Symmetry: C2
Subunit: 265 residues, 2 copies
């Protein structure tokens, strides 16, 4: 009745997760079933499967509800500046819009968190320092980003019962896609430094909506479904959760080509 | 529209929380209102109000769902032993049955957590080491426990919009109450040691139900209401949350006397 650390690791191996993999996980912890240790069983099983040479990653983002108050150029009105909690990669909470597992991973001892607040990833394992180092603050879903390093390292992405449109890596595909009409987001962000709070503008392609017009809000799920329909990736149960496992470089290139075929030239 | 770290600290001062206090908080974060930093705003405001000489505490307990499998003497059947995650005071999650604030406090850098799993408290501040040191593993709600040290240190308890029957300190009153028919709980618990997992039986008065028969499940709230009705404690809003602040020694002695008057001799 209880899914365990041992049984989940067996399900992960049967799905294709391998010793030494860098694995990025999107989880719906409720769908996994009754767990003896809650979400930490999932983290433990992932670490056991990849071993000390692997790395476990998740999309952390940043719990910053102050974006309801910015004006027209993305900056904070001066009566609110001293009240917005600044971003600390070691202390700021991961966003919980898509489950508690990122925050659970972030607070696991040894986990590192990258410096771009909205695009931050958490990494736990062999390559955690490299995955989270020198995150570019502008266009943090593109070159030199942790999502680009996951593709370069030959990483994988696991949708552990999570909706397929929550696959963060496809934002890296939107960034790379050579198409016109790509939407942009600008916002001012507070950073915590050893000398006090310092502000900075952030520019990036808007990941709060489809990269261009004419796309449904959940169009990432259709891209994943077509990817699986083409015979790529792997499906199977992780505990009680229907899960999907895909290669990071493959799904990224598939996402770029999916966009460059319907738009641009 | 946004309750802030500054405005919450002002509400806490108006309620009676003082510089240097050791404060134990039970919070219903939803009732506080819209917060710029989520639960961490509450933790920050409490720390600002008590200053570096104060201490912030919460009831952590332990997320251990394995108690559905124990037999008659409280022990784990041998086919489940290696699957139960052992208790690590630095890694085990705080229970989330009564809100996320204990876990948020537990994962705040510098917070310490005591050694008795089911009765564990988290403490952040000047006296954190003393509050969490040498927690007796048997009858962890009594002598030498963190709840006893809060009374001895002249601490306070803040019900920040939380239901009044979640006041953990009244379990210390149940332990001290010289009354007959007090119910007992025994359970086997796994501990993580530098040499591997070690098991141990735990005995204590059962805090999963009223200490004796004839009491409603929520009878702590009536004790708090009578305490406030007698002109003790303080009421007021913390943000949008109706809150109660009480002296730890006073509410403990009131709880003991409440029990010794209706039962025993
Ligand atoms: N979706 C409509 C847009 O939502 C924007 O706000 C959105 C963003 O703040 C945020 O979008 C995040 C994004 O920040 C983050 N960097 C990437 C992440 N995939 C997005 O996630 C969002 O979109 C996905 C897919 O629909 C959902 O699964 C997720 O729950 C949703 N929050 O979530 C909000 C809800 O979508 C703005 N209100 C405006 O541009 C517009 O209303
Ligand atoms: N309440 C009935 C009892 O619940 C027991 O299980 C209970 C315990 O495991 C646990 O009780 C915890 C206790 O562990 C912990 N050390 C102290 C804490 N105050 C209690 O909390 C419990 O009681 C309070 C008041 O009703 C509730 O506010 C709280 O949500 C509830 N979980 O919560 C469970 C639900 O009450 C057993 N099932 C059995 O003895 C009996 O069914």
């Amino acid at each position: 009745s209880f899914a365990t650390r041992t049984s989940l690791a067996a399900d992960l191996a049967a799905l294709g997760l391998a010793w030494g993999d860098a694995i990025m996980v999107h989880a719906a912890v409720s769908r996994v079933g009754r767990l003896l240790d809650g979400p930490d069983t999932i983290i433990a099983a992932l670490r056991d499967t990849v071993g000390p040479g692997g790395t476990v990653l998740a999309y952390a983002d940043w719990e910053a509800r102050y974006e309801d108050l910015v004006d027209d150029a993305g900056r904070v009105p001066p009566e609110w500046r001293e009240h917005v909690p600044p971003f600390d990669p070691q202390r700021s909470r991961a966003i919980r819009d898509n489950g508690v597992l990122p925050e659970f991973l972030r607070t696991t001892p040894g986990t590192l968190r990258s410096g771009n607040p909205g695009a931050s990833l958490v990494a736990l394992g062999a390559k955690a320092e490299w995955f989270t180092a020198d995150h570019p603050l502008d266009y943090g879903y593109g070159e030199g980003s942790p999502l680009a390093k996951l593709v370069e390292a030959g990483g994988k992405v696991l949708m552990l019962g999570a909706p397929l449109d929550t696959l963060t890596l496809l934002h890296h595909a939107e960034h790379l896609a050579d198409i016109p009409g790509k939407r942009i987001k600008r916002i001012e962000v507070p950073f915590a430094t050893p000398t006090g709070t310092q502000w900075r503008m952030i520019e990036e392609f808007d990941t709060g909506d489809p990269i261009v017009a004419g796309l449904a809000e959940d169009y990432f799920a259709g891209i994943v479904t077509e990817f699986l329909a083409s015979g790529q990736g792997r499906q199977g149960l992780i505990g009680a959760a229907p899960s999907v496992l895909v290669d990071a470089a493959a799904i990224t290139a598939f996402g770029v080509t999916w966009l460059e075929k319907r738009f641009g030239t």
